[PDB]
PDB file of C-alpha atoms and ligand atoms in Angstrom:
ATOM      1  CA  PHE M   1      10.460  -9.251 -17.747  1.00 50.95           C
ATOM      2  CA  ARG M   2      12.276  -6.217 -19.235  1.00 51.66           C
ATOM      3  CA  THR M   3      12.628  -2.512 -18.512  1.00 55.38           C
ATOM      4  CA  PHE M   4      13.499   0.258 -21.046  1.00 53.74           C
ATOM      5  CA  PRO M   5      17.205   1.263 -21.462  1.00 55.22           C
ATOM      6  CA  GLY M   6      18.679   3.360 -18.640  1.00 54.43           C
ATOM      7  CA  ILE M   7      15.631   2.168 -16.687  1.00 53.46           C
ATOM      8  CA  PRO M   8      13.454   5.313 -16.885  1.00 53.21           C
ATOM      9  CA  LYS M   9      10.909   5.232 -14.021  1.00 51.94           C
ATOM     10  CA  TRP M  10       8.620   7.696 -12.337  1.00 53.83           C
ATOM     11  CA  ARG M  11      10.426   9.409  -9.444  1.00 51.12           C
ATOM     12  CA  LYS M  12       7.290   9.969  -7.300  1.00 49.75           C
ATOM     13  CA  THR M  13       4.695   7.432  -6.238  1.00 46.18           C
ATOM     14  CA  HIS M  14       1.609   9.454  -6.919  1.00 43.22           C
ATOM     15  CA  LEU M  15       0.689   9.739 -10.618  1.00 43.95           C
ATOM     16  CA  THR M  16      -2.165  11.560 -12.278  1.00 45.10           C
ATOM     17  CA  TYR M  17      -4.010  10.528 -15.423  1.00 46.84           C
ATOM     18  CA  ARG M  18      -6.447  12.203 -17.747  1.00 50.52           C
ATOM     19  CA  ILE M  19      -8.771  10.630 -20.288  1.00 48.68           C
ATOM     20  CA  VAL M  20      -8.551  13.190 -23.049  1.00 45.22           C
ATOM     21  CA  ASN M  21     -11.320  11.862 -25.297  1.00 46.50           C
ATOM     22  CA  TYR M  22     -13.738   8.990 -25.774  1.00 46.17           C
ATOM     23  CA  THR M  23     -14.193   6.314 -28.533  1.00 47.27           C
ATOM     24  CA  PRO M  24     -17.620   6.034 -30.169  1.00 46.96           C
ATOM     25  CA  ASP M  25     -17.256   2.213 -29.732  1.00 49.95           C
ATOM     26  CA  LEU M  26     -18.331   2.154 -26.082  1.00 49.57           C
ATOM     27  CA  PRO M  27     -20.281   4.010 -23.445  1.00 49.17           C
ATOM     28  CA  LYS M  28     -18.126   6.470 -21.562  1.00 47.74           C
ATOM     29  CA  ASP M  29     -18.596   4.453 -18.238  1.00 44.58           C
ATOM     30  CA  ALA M  30     -17.040   1.429 -19.912  1.00 42.32           C
ATOM     31  CA  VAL M  31     -13.994   3.416 -21.056  1.00 42.61           C
ATOM     32  CA  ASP M  32     -13.602   4.906 -17.520  1.00 41.46           C
ATOM     33  CA  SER M  33     -14.007   1.433 -15.967  1.00 39.21           C
ATOM     34  CA  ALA M  34     -11.517  -0.292 -18.202  1.00 37.00           C
ATOM     35  CA  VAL M  35      -8.844   2.385 -17.581  1.00 38.42           C
ATOM     36  CA  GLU M  36      -9.488   2.335 -13.854  1.00 39.16           C
ATOM     37  CA  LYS M  37      -9.199  -1.412 -13.710  1.00 37.29           C
ATOM     38  CA  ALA M  38      -6.015  -1.216 -15.757  1.00 33.26           C
ATOM     39  CA  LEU M  39      -4.435   1.179 -13.324  1.00 34.82           C
ATOM     40  CA  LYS M  40      -5.621  -0.922 -10.288  1.00 34.96           C
ATOM     41  CA  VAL M  41      -3.874  -4.000 -11.618  1.00 37.20           C
ATOM     42  CA  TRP M  42      -0.484  -2.253 -11.155  1.00 35.24           C
ATOM     43  CA  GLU M  43      -1.496  -0.208  -8.036  1.00 36.50           C
ATOM     44  CA  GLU M  44      -2.211  -3.471  -6.297  1.00 33.22           C
ATOM     45  CA  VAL M  45       1.370  -4.694  -6.473  1.00 35.26           C
ATOM     46  CA  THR M  46       3.436  -1.541  -6.008  1.00 34.02           C
ATOM     47  CA  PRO M  47       3.215   1.512  -3.802  1.00 36.47           C
ATOM     48  CA  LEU M  48       1.976   3.539  -6.852  1.00 37.08           C
ATOM     49  CA  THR M  49      -1.307   5.435  -6.499  1.00 35.79           C
ATOM     50  CA  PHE M  50      -3.237   7.289  -9.299  1.00 36.43           C
ATOM     51  CA  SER M  51      -5.765  10.078  -9.359  1.00 37.88           C
ATOM     52  CA  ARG M  52      -7.783  11.421 -12.249  1.00 37.95           C
ATOM     53  CA  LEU M  53      -7.503  15.005 -13.482  1.00 39.36           C
ATOM     54  CA  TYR M  54     -10.189  16.577 -15.598  1.00 38.32           C
ATOM     55  CA  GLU M  55      -8.154  19.663 -16.581  1.00 37.00           C
ATOM     56  CA  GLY M  56      -4.557  20.772 -16.733  1.00 36.20           C
ATOM     57  CA  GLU M  57      -1.594  18.524 -17.319  1.00 34.97           C
ATOM     58  CA  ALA M  58      -1.569  14.916 -16.060  1.00 33.56           C
ATOM     59  CA  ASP M  59       1.338  12.501 -15.984  1.00 32.10           C
ATOM     60  CA  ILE M  60      -0.425   9.878 -18.154  1.00 33.68           C
ATOM     61  CA  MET M  61      -2.573  11.395 -20.912  1.00 35.88           C
ATOM     62  CA  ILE M  62      -4.872   8.711 -22.371  1.00 35.93           C
ATOM     63  CA  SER M  63      -6.440   9.197 -25.842  1.00 32.97           C
ATOM     64  CA  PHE M  64      -8.093   7.497 -28.841  1.00 32.23           C
ATOM     65  CA  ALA M  65      -6.570   8.252 -32.255  1.00 34.96           C
ATOM     66  CA  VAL M  66      -6.497   7.159 -35.885  1.00 34.00           C
ATOM     67  CA  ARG M  67      -3.553   7.370 -38.322  1.00 32.98           C
ATOM     68  CA  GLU M  68      -1.598  10.620 -37.916  1.00 29.70           C
ATOM     69  CA  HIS M  69      -2.480  11.976 -34.506  1.00 25.68           C
ATOM     70  CA  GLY M  70       0.337  14.300 -33.532  1.00 24.01           C
ATOM     71  CA  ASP M  71       3.455  12.374 -32.713  1.00 22.90           C
ATOM     72  CA  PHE M  72       5.780  10.646 -35.101  1.00 18.75           C
ATOM     73  CA  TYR M  73       4.152   7.192 -35.021  1.00 20.66           C
ATOM     74  CA  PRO M  74       0.935   7.119 -36.987  1.00 14.59           C
ATOM     75  CA  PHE M  75      -1.562   4.339 -36.442  1.00 14.15           C
ATOM     76  CA  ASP M  76      -2.212   1.746 -39.164  1.00 15.73           C
ATOM     77  CA  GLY M  77      -5.947   1.136 -39.662  1.00 17.55           C
ATOM     78  CA  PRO M  78      -7.744  -2.018 -38.451  1.00 19.19           C
ATOM     79  CA  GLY M  79      -5.714  -4.657 -36.522  1.00 17.04           C
ATOM     80  CA  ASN M  80      -1.944  -5.022 -36.207  1.00 14.74           C
ATOM     81  CA  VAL M  81      -0.861  -2.103 -33.917  1.00 16.76           C
ATOM     82  CA  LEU M  82      -3.746  -1.686 -31.425  1.00 16.34           C
ATOM     83  CA  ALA M  83      -2.233   0.989 -29.147  1.00 17.46           C
ATOM     84  CA  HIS M  84       1.180   2.437 -28.109  1.00 19.13           C
ATOM     85  CA  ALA M  85       2.545   4.091 -24.970  1.00 18.86           C
ATOM     86  CA  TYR M  86       5.738   5.993 -24.056  1.00 21.41           C
ATOM     87  CA  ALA M  87       8.006   5.211 -21.117  1.00 22.76           C
ATOM     88  CA  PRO M  88       7.950   7.464 -18.004  1.00 24.56           C
ATOM     89  CA  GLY M  89       9.142  11.092 -18.275  1.00 25.56           C
ATOM     90  CA  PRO M  90       7.684  14.605 -18.832  1.00 26.24           C
ATOM     91  CA  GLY M  91       5.447  15.735 -21.754  1.00 28.04           C
ATOM     92  CA  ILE M  92       4.317  12.937 -24.146  1.00 27.71           C
ATOM     93  CA  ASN M  93       6.266  10.438 -22.019  1.00 24.50           C
ATOM     94  CA  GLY M  94       3.969   8.271 -19.963  1.00 21.86           C
ATOM     95  CA  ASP M  95       1.083   8.843 -22.378  1.00 24.47           C
ATOM     96  CA  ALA M  96      -0.912   6.028 -24.024  1.00 25.58           C
ATOM     97  CA  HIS M  97      -2.652   6.258 -27.396  1.00 25.02           C
ATOM     98  CA  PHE M  98      -5.299   3.735 -28.602  1.00 26.16           C
ATOM     99  CA  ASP M  99      -6.009   3.092 -32.279  1.00 27.04           C
ATOM    100  CA  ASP M 100      -9.724   3.825 -32.827  1.00 29.45           C
ATOM    101  CA  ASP M 101      -9.639   1.873 -36.112  1.00 30.07           C
ATOM    102  CA  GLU M 102      -9.993  -1.045 -33.694  1.00 32.54           C
ATOM    103  CA  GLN M 103     -13.438  -1.925 -32.308  1.00 31.25           C
ATOM    104  CA  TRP M 104     -12.930  -1.488 -28.558  1.00 34.60           C
ATOM    105  CA  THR M 105     -15.154  -3.817 -26.384  1.00 33.50           C
ATOM    106  CA  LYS M 106     -16.027  -4.501 -22.732  1.00 30.13           C
ATOM    107  CA  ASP M 107     -15.930  -8.193 -23.573  1.00 30.91           C
ATOM    108  CA  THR M 108     -13.866 -10.241 -26.005  1.00 24.98           C
ATOM    109  CA  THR M 109     -15.955  -9.809 -29.206  1.00 23.81           C
ATOM    110  CA  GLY M 110     -13.731  -6.975 -30.547  1.00 28.58           C
ATOM    111  CA  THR M 111     -10.527  -5.693 -29.028  1.00 25.49           C
ATOM    112  CA  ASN M 112     -10.753  -5.728 -25.183  1.00 26.53           C
ATOM    113  CA  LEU M 113     -10.000  -2.212 -23.930  1.00 29.27           C
ATOM    114  CA  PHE M 114      -9.130  -3.364 -20.391  1.00 29.73           C
ATOM    115  CA  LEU M 115      -6.452  -5.886 -21.490  1.00 28.88           C
ATOM    116  CA  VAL M 116      -4.786  -3.561 -23.967  1.00 27.11           C
ATOM    117  CA  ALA M 117      -4.879  -0.647 -21.478  1.00 24.53           C
ATOM    118  CA  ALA M 118      -3.282  -2.867 -18.752  1.00 23.86           C
ATOM    119  CA  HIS M 119      -0.482  -3.772 -21.158  1.00 21.99           C
ATOM    120  CA  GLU M 120       0.003  -0.147 -22.330  1.00 21.79           C
ATOM    121  CA  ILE M 121       0.032   1.242 -18.791  1.00 23.58           C
ATOM    122  CA  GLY M 122       2.767  -1.308 -18.121  1.00 25.17           C
ATOM    123  CA  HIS M 123       4.840   0.602 -20.698  1.00 23.38           C
ATOM    124  CA  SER M 124       3.782   3.975 -19.190  1.00 24.52           C
ATOM    125  CA  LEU M 125       5.276   2.751 -15.922  1.00 23.69           C
ATOM    126  CA  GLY M 126       8.557   1.532 -17.253  1.00 24.83           C
ATOM    127  CA  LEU M 127       8.114  -2.097 -18.370  1.00 21.73           C
ATOM    128  CA  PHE M 128       9.303  -3.177 -21.838  1.00 19.45           C
ATOM    129  CA  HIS M 129       8.202  -6.513 -23.400  1.00 17.15           C
ATOM    130  CA  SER M 130       8.568  -9.758 -21.530  1.00 19.12           C
ATOM    131  CA  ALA M 131      10.017 -12.924 -22.938  1.00 22.99           C
ATOM    132  CA  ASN M 132       7.423 -14.709 -20.792  1.00 22.52           C
ATOM    133  CA  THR M 133       4.560 -16.071 -22.894  1.00 25.57           C
ATOM    134  CA  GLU M 134       1.916 -15.700 -20.181  1.00 26.26           C
ATOM    135  CA  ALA M 135       2.991 -12.200 -19.078  1.00 25.37           C
ATOM    136  CA  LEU M 136       0.589  -9.283 -19.539  1.00 27.36           C
ATOM    137  CA  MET M 137       3.748  -7.638 -20.985  1.00 26.74           C
ATOM    138  CA  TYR M 138       4.171 -10.259 -23.671  1.00 26.92           C
ATOM    139  CA  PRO M 139       3.862  -8.271 -26.852  1.00 21.35           C
ATOM    140  CA  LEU M 140       1.153 -10.210 -28.580  1.00 21.54           C
ATOM    141  CA  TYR M 141      -2.570  -9.704 -28.129  1.00 18.19           C
ATOM    142  CA  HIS M 142      -4.002 -13.134 -27.174  1.00 18.90           C
ATOM    143  CA  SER M 143      -7.805 -12.866 -26.886  1.00 20.23           C
ATOM    144  CA  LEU M 144      -7.543 -14.180 -23.313  1.00 21.54           C
ATOM    145  CA  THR M 145      -9.986 -15.676 -23.504  1.00 19.59           C
ATOM    146  CA  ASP M 146     -12.272 -15.271 -20.454  1.00 18.70           C
ATOM    147  CA  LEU M 147     -11.024 -12.182 -18.633  1.00 19.09           C
ATOM    148  CA  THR M 148     -12.812 -13.377 -15.533  1.00 19.06           C
ATOM    149  CA  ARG M 149      -9.704 -14.605 -13.737  1.00 20.24           C
ATOM    150  CA  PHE M 150      -7.219 -12.322 -15.402  1.00 21.15           C
ATOM    151  CA  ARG M 151      -4.263 -11.859 -13.061  1.00 25.75           C
ATOM    152  CA  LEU M 152      -0.835 -10.357 -13.644  1.00 26.42           C
ATOM    153  CA  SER M 153       1.856 -12.830 -14.101  1.00 27.73           C
ATOM    154  CA  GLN M 154       4.351 -13.092 -11.433  1.00 29.97           C
ATOM    155  CA  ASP M 155       6.800 -11.975 -14.125  1.00 28.47           C
ATOM    156  CA  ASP M 156       4.882  -8.707 -14.535  1.00 30.67           C
ATOM    157  CA  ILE M 157       4.831  -8.482 -10.747  1.00 29.01           C
ATOM    158  CA  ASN M 158       8.636  -9.062 -10.644  1.00 26.99           C
ATOM    159  CA  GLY M 159       9.257  -6.416 -13.380  1.00 27.18           C
ATOM    160  CA  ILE M 160       7.162  -3.676 -11.826  1.00 30.76           C
ATOM    161  CA  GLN M 161       8.343  -4.372  -8.242  1.00 28.57           C
ATOM    162  CA  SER M 162      11.920  -4.246  -9.423  1.00 29.01           C
ATOM    163  CA  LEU M 163      11.168  -0.636 -10.370  1.00 34.53           C
ATOM    164  CA  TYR M 164       8.933   0.575  -7.535  1.00 34.99           C
ATOM    165  CA  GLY M 165       9.048  -2.165  -4.872  1.00 32.80           C
ATOM    166  CA  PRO M 166       6.089  -4.150  -3.405  1.00 28.93           C
ATOM    167  CA  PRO M 167       3.176  -2.514  -1.614  1.00 30.85           C
ATOM    168  CA  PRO M 168       4.426  -0.747   1.626  1.00 32.13           C
TER     169      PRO M 168
HETATM  170 CA1   CA R   1       2.903  12.539 -19.992  1.00 27.27          CA
HETATM  171 CA1   CA R   2      -4.349  -0.716 -35.885  1.00 22.37          CA
HETATM  172 CA1   CA R   3     -13.210   2.271 -33.091  1.00 20.52          CA
HETATM  173 CL1   CL R   4      -3.086  15.896 -20.142  1.00 23.65          CL
HETATM  174 ZN1   ZN R   5       0.644   8.055 -30.655  1.00 22.45          ZN
HETATM  175 ZN1   ZN R   6       3.701  -3.594 -25.676  1.00 23.61          ZN
END
């Protein structure tokens, strides 16, 4: 695994998130579920906990965007860059943006929102890209397939635990 330079990490174990808006690709319950599952994946192996805010300022602001969307890194239309997320810190840091020129799916027929969100939340928490080819943190989107038995790599486990420790 890898962290970001100077190892930026959250300095508190309880993090808030807010889902700022919703793709037309999917029912709202399926967006909420995928994001929840993505946070749980990391919760499970650290002493991090998350709660959802519906108003005010959250640590991890999650949004769907196309092209220019208010930072310096515009999205690129269909495929290629699917999403991007900033390392821990105040303001835009921690936040995760999802390119809505993808077709976001609950399954594997378009782009799987759960898998990409798990990977992006990894960045929100302080993990950079892994050299490991089976790691969730491996850069490249590999259509699983079959997300039935998805489990974090050890490597991802080693990375995140090296930042926040194992569950208490
Ligand atoms: Ca933030
Ligand atoms: Ca794209
Ligand atoms: Ca879309
Ligand atoms: Cl927010
Ligand atoms: Zn962005
Ligand atoms: Zn990545």
